[PDB]
Amino acid sequence: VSVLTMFRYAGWLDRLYMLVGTLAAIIHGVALPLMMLIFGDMTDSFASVGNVSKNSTNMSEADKRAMFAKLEEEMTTYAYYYTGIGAGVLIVAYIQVSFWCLAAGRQIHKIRQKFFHAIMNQEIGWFDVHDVGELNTRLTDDVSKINEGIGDKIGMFFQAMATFFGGFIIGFTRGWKLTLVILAISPVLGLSAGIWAKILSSFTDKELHAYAKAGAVAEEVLAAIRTVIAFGGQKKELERYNNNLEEAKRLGIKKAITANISMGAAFLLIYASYALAFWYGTSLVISKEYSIGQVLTVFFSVLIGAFSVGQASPNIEAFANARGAAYEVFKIIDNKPSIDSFSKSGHKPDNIQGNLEFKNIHFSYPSRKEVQILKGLNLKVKSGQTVALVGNSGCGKSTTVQLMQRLYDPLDGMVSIDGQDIRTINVRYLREIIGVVSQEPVLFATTIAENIRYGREDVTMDEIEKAVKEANAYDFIMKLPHQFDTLVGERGAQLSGGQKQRIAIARALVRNPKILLLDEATSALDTESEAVVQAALDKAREGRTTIVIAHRLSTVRNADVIAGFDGGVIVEQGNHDELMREKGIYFKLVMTQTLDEDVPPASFWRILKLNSTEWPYFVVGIFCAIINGGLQPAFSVIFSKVVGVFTNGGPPETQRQNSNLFSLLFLILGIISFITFFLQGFTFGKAGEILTKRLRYMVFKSMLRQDVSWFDDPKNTTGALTTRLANDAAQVKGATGSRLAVIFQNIANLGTGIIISLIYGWQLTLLLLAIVPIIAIAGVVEMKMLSGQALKDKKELEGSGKIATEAIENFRTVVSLTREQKFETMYAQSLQIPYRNAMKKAHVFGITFSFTQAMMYFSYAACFRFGAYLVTQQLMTFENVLLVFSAIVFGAMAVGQVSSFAPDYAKATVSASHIIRIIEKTPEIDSYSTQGLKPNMLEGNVQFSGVVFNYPTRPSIPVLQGLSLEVKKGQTLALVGSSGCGKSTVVQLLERFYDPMAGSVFLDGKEIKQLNVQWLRAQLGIVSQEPILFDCSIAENIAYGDNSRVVSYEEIVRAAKEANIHQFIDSLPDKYNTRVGDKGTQLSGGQKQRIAIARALVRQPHILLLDEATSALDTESEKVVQEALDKAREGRTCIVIAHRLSTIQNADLIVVIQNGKVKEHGTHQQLLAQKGIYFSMVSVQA
C-alpha cells in the first residue's frame, strides 16, 4: 500500500507496458543461464571428440569422419545458439529499457506537475515552516531519485530472475543431486564469502566514521583570514591536529583499508575456495558418478546466480532510497492539507464596496506556543477612509494587516470584510479585491510590462500605461532604456527600491482593489523617495478604503483614524489630535521620535612527476601489483588446463591431475592473492597516508604564506578552501593509487595475456583482440552517450527548475495569487519539451543497451565457432579455446580494474591540479630582509606619494587615482572620505596587503613596497570594524603571538589595563583563562574591541590603524573605547579613519579625501573655514 502502491500509482497502458517489459527482463536473465547450459552441450560434444582424438593410433578415416561430422554438427548448434540467445538479448533488452523510461518517464512527469501545483497549494505553511530553500531543493532532488527508482528497479527484477531461474534451472535440472552437490558446496561457499566479507566491509564503515571525526579535528577554523595575516601564521596547530588524527586513523582505517585489501583478499581467498570445493567436488562426481566433464556448466552457472544476486542488491537499494524518500516526501506531496485557504469556488461578493470589521479576534501565530498576538482585538473601519496603525514592539499590527488577506485563519473571533465574514468569501476573489503592498518590493526576473502583467493577466500596455502613469512611474521607465520592455537583471536587483516599490504600486494598482493595505511600504527607503512614494500611495488611496501600518507619523497625520498598537496591545483610536489630547500611546511614541570552479589547465603526467616527488619509494608496491596480474591470467591458464586435461587426456591420474590443479588453484590464487594484496595494501596504502598528510601541510602553508588579492578579494570561501584541503589531499591519493593500478592491470592483461597469446594459435589471438577492444569501445561510448543525455536533460529541467524555484522562493506571488497555475502552466510548457525529449532519449537508452548485449552474444558466436574451426582428423583447434577465451577474460579483468579501486582518476586529477596550482602559489610576502630595523626606524612618519591602486577588478576604475597623503610621528592622522572604500584601502595599502598600481609609501624613510613586509606588519595597531578572536582564551588572545613574542603575563596585564577590558578580566569566572566561549558568542562587540585594542597595544605599535573601530556600539563602550584609544594614541602615530563626524574633532590632520583623490585637509575649524565638502558633512550631521 501507501509506500509502494502510491509510489507506483498512475498508469493505464503504462502499468501494462511496465509489466510487459518486466517479462522481457525475466526472459533476459534466464537468457543468460540458458547461454550457460549451451556452453555445456558444446563443451561436451567437444570433449568427446578430444577423448577419441586421444586414443587415435587407429582408424584415420573413421576419425576424419567422426570429427568432421561432430564439427559441423555443433558448428550448427552454435549458429542456432547465438542466433537464439542473441536475437533474444537484443530484442527484450531494448524492451525492458523502454519500461524504464516510458514508465518512470510519464510517471515522474505526472508527479512533476502534481508537485509544483502541490507546493503552490500548501499555502501559508510553506512560509510557516519548511526551509522554502531546502524545499525546491528536495523538489528537484527527490523527483529525480523517484525516477532512478523506477528504472534501476526494472534492472533489478532482471538480475533477480537471472539468479533465481538460472541457479535454479541449472542448479537442479543438471545434476539431480550433483547439481545439488553444487548447491551444497557452491551456495555454502557463497554464504561464508558474503558473510566474512560484509562483516569486515562494515568494519571499514566504522573506520571511515572514525576518520570523519579525525577529519573535523583536522579542520578547525580557517576563516578570519585577514586578521590572521595581520597576526602572523598558525602553522603548528593546523599541522599538529592535522597529521595527528590523520596518521592515527590513517594507519588505522588503512589497517581496514589494508583490511579492505584483506577483504578483496578474503573474497579472493574464498574465491579460491569456490574453486577448491568446486573442482574437487567435481573431480570426484565426475570420475566416479556422472562422468561428463561438463559439470562445469551447472557449477559455474550457479556461480552466476550468486553474482547476479549482488547486482540485484544495488538495484534494489536504489528502489529503496527511491521508494523511501519518494513516498515520504510524496506524502508531503500528493497530500492536500490546505483547507486553511485553498483556491476554488467559494462565495462571490459583487456588491463591490464594503467596510472592514475586526470583531474580537484572538490570534496566536502558527508557532503553537507563540503567545497570541491578538489577545482579543476589536477594530472596525468604515469605507472611503484611511486608517493607520502604529506600533513599535513588533508583531500585532502587521498581524492584523496580515489576516486581512485571510492569510492565517483567525484562532478565535472573526473578521468581516464588507459585511460578510472573510472566511466565507472565495479566497482568490478576496485576494484580488484586496490590493496590498508590503515593504519588500518583490520584482520578477522579467520586464516591467510583465511584473505589471503579473499583477493582472489580461491587460493592454494601454492600461499599464495609465496604471504606471498613475503610480507615477511613467518617467523613469521612459528614461529607462528598452522602455516598458525593460528587464530586471536576474531578480529585483537593477533599480532603486523606491522605484521597485513604486512599480509594485503600479502592479497592485492595475489590480485596483477596494481594500488597500500598506505594511510600512515607504519604510526602509531614503527620504526623497519616501516623499514621492507616499505621494503615489496617496493618489491610489482614498478611492479605496485603506489601512496602513507605518512608522512615519508624518505620513500618519492625514489619517482618518489612528490605531493604537505597539506589539499586540490595542488601545487609543480616533483622530491625531484626539490621541495627542489623550497624551497616551500615540502622543508618547509620536513624541518619542519627535560553489563553482573548474579550471582549463589540467596536468598531463605533471601530477605523476609531482606524484613521485610526493613519494619516497615503493617499487615493492608496483611489484606485487605486477605479480598480481600474472596471478590473474594464471588462474586463467590453470583453469583451461583443468577443464582440458580432464576433457581430453589419459584415463589414469585423472584424479591426480584434478586433485593437483584444483589444489594448485587454491594455493596459487588464494595465497599469492591474499599476500600480494595485504602486502600492497600496506605499501600503497601508507602511500596515500603520507601523501595526504604531507600534501595538506604544504597546501595549507602555501595558503598561509599566500594572501594578497587572494583572501583580500577572494571568491574562494573558507569552506571551499577547507574542502579543498580534505577532498584534494584525498584525490591525489587516488592519483598515486591509480598509477599503481595502471601498471598492474597492464602487465597483468597486456603481458601475461600476450605471452599466453603467443602460445595461442593465431586465429584466436586476432579474432579476440578485435572482440575485446571493440566491445570495450562500445562500453566507453555507452557511458559517454548516457552522461550526455543525462547532462543536457539536467539543463532543460534546470531552466524549468530555476523559474519554478523563483516562484516558490518568492512566495510573495501568492499575494496576487493571480498566477499560481499561470506559473506552473509556463513550467508545464518547459516541462512539455523535456517530456517529449525524455521519450526520444528513452528509446535511446533502449537501442544502446541492446546493441551492447548484441555485441555480447556476437562476440561469443565468433569466438567459439571460429575456434572450433576445421577439426577433420584432428586439427590445431581443441581445448586451447579456453586459453583464448582467457584472453577475452583478460580484457574483462581490465574492466574489473577501471570499474574498481581509486576513482576514475578523472576527478582525482582535476582535484590534483587544483591542490597543485595552490600549493605552488607565488609567496608574494613571506620572510626576506628589505630593512634591518635600525634602532632609529622607530618614527612612524607615513608617506603616500602618488598612491594609485584598486584591488583586483581594475576595469571597475581604480578607487585610488593619483592619491597623496602623509603623517608625522607620535600624532593622530584624521581620515574621512565619502563612504566605505578609500579609508580601508589606505589602511590596507599601509599593511601592504595590496601594492599600489603607481606610486609608493614611506613608513618612516625607507620605501614601503620595498621595506620588510614582515616588520611593516610587526608594527601595526590594526583594529577594523568587525573584530575577531579565535576560540582561544582571552589571555592567549590578548597575548596575540605576533611572533616569538612569548605570552608575557604582566605584559598582557598591561593590555587589559590600557585596553579597558581588565573589568571583565577582574572577576568573571577563570579571569584570564576564559576561552572566548563557543567561538566568541558571549561578549559584546565593545568587549571584543577592548581585546582588539589590547592586541594592538600588546604589540606596542608605532602606528595605530583605526578602521572606524567603534561603528556599531553604544554607551560607555564608545566612551571607554575612545578613552583607551585616547591613551592608546599620541605616544605613537595613528591613522584613525572613521565615519564619526563627531568624535573626529580631536585630530591633528584631518584629511577629507574624495574617493581616489583628497579634496580638502588641515585642522577642523580651518576645514570649517573652508565652506564646502567638510562643511556639508558637519551640516548634514546636525
Ligand X SMILES: CC(C)[C@H]1NC(=O)c2c[se]c(n2)[C@@H](C(C)C)NC(=O)c2c[se]c(n2)[C@@H](C(C)C)NC(=O)c2c[se]c1n2
Q: Which residues, 6 or more positions from 1129, have their beta carbon under 8 angstroms from its beta carbon? A: 972, 1104, 1136
CB of 835 to ligand X, least distance (A): 38
983 assigned ligand-binding residue: yes
Residue 484 gets which letter from DSSP? G
CB of 770 to ligand X, least distance (A): 18
CB of 292 to ligand X, least distance (A): 17
Spatial separation of the C-alpha atoms in residues 398 and 403, rounded to whole Å: 9
State the cell numbers at 735: 592519483
CB of 742 to ligand X, least distance (A): 19
- Residue number with CB closer to ligand X (81 or 635): 635
Q: Is the dihedral of CA 535, 536, 537, 541 positive or negative?
A: positive
396 assigned ligand-binding residue: yes
The H or E element containing residue 562 is strand 561-564
Spatial separation of the C-alpha atoms in residues 605 and 612, rounded to whole Å: 10
- The amino acid present at 1116, given as its one-letter code, is E
- Residue number with CB closer to ligand X (7 or 635): 635
- Residue number with CB closer to ligand X (179 or 886): 886
Residue among 422, 416, 410, 401 nearest 363 (CA):
410
What DSSP string runs through 168-233? HHHHHHTTTTHHHHHHHHHHHHHHHHHHHHHHHHHHHHHHHHHHHHHHHTTT-----HHHHHTT--
398 assigned ligand-binding residue: yes
Which residues lie across from 561 on neighbouring strands? 387
- Residue number with CB closer to ligand X (900 or 1145): 900
Q: Which residues, 6 or more positions from 9, have their beta carbon under 8 angstroms from its beta carbon? A: none
Residue among 597, 573, 871, 543 nearest 724 (CA):
597
Spatial separation of the C-alpha atoms in residues 1162 and 171, rounded to whole Å: 101
- Residue number with CB closer to ligand X (310 or 650): 310
Residue among 167, 189, 350 nearest 271 (CA):
189
395 assigned ligand-binding residue: yes
392 assigned ligand-binding residue: yes
- Residue number with CB closer to ligand X (642 or 1125): 642
CB of 875 to ligand X, least distance (A): 21
Query: Quick one: how many helices (H) and strands (E) in the chain?
Result: 41, 19
CB of 885 to ligand X, least distance (A): 5
- Residue number with CB closer to ligand X (515 or 889): 889
Which residues lie across from 1046 on neighbouring strands? none
CB of 178 to ligand X, least distance (A): 19
CB of 627 to ligand X, least distance (A): 17
CB of 19 to ligand X, least distance (A): 28
- Residue number with CB closer to ligand X (170 or 318): 170
CB of 612 to ligand X, least distance (A): 32
979 assigned ligand-binding residue: yes
1032 assigned ligand-binding residue: no
**To 10 degrees, what angle do helices 906-920 and 673-705 make?**
40
751 assigned ligand-binding residue: no
Which residues form the interface with ligand X (CB under 6 A)?
303-304, 307, 635-636, 639, 882, 885-886, 889, 892
- Residue number with CB closer to ligand X (273 or 984): 273
CB 1173 within 8 A of CB 1159: yes
Spatial separation of the C-alpha atoms in residues 172 and 271, rounded to whole Å: 23
Task: Kindly report the length of the chain.
Answer: 1182
- Residue number with CB closer to ligand X (229 or 303): 303
1134 assigned ligand-binding residue: no
Residue among 674, 682, 684, 741 nearest 265 (CA):
674
Determine the Cα angle at 64 with ends 62 and 65, to 5°. 65
The H or E element containing residue 120 is helix 87-122
Cα separation values, 424 from 50, 105, 406, 447, 769, Å: 93, 41, 10, 36, 79
CB of 48 to ligand X, least distance (A): 19
- The amino acid present at 1060, given as its one-letter code, is N
- Residue number with CB closer to ligand X (399 or 636): 636
With cell 573548474, the residue in question is 598
CA gyration radius, the chain: 40
CB 531 within 8 A of CB 539: no
981 assigned ligand-binding residue: yes
CB 406 within 8 A of CB 486: no
Report residue 271 CA to chain centroid gap.
39
567 assigned ligand-binding residue: no
The H or E element containing residue 379 is strand 374-381
391 assigned ligand-binding residue: yes
- Residue number with CB closer to ligand X (673 or 1117): 673
CB of 640 to ligand X, least distance (A): 6
- The amino acid present at 38, given as its one-letter code, is I
CB 122 within 8 A of CB 338: yes
Residue 1133 gets which letter from DSSP? B
- Residue number with CB closer to ligand X (852 or 1122): 852
Binding site: which residues?
391-398, 977-984
Binding site for ATP: which residues?
391-398, 977-984
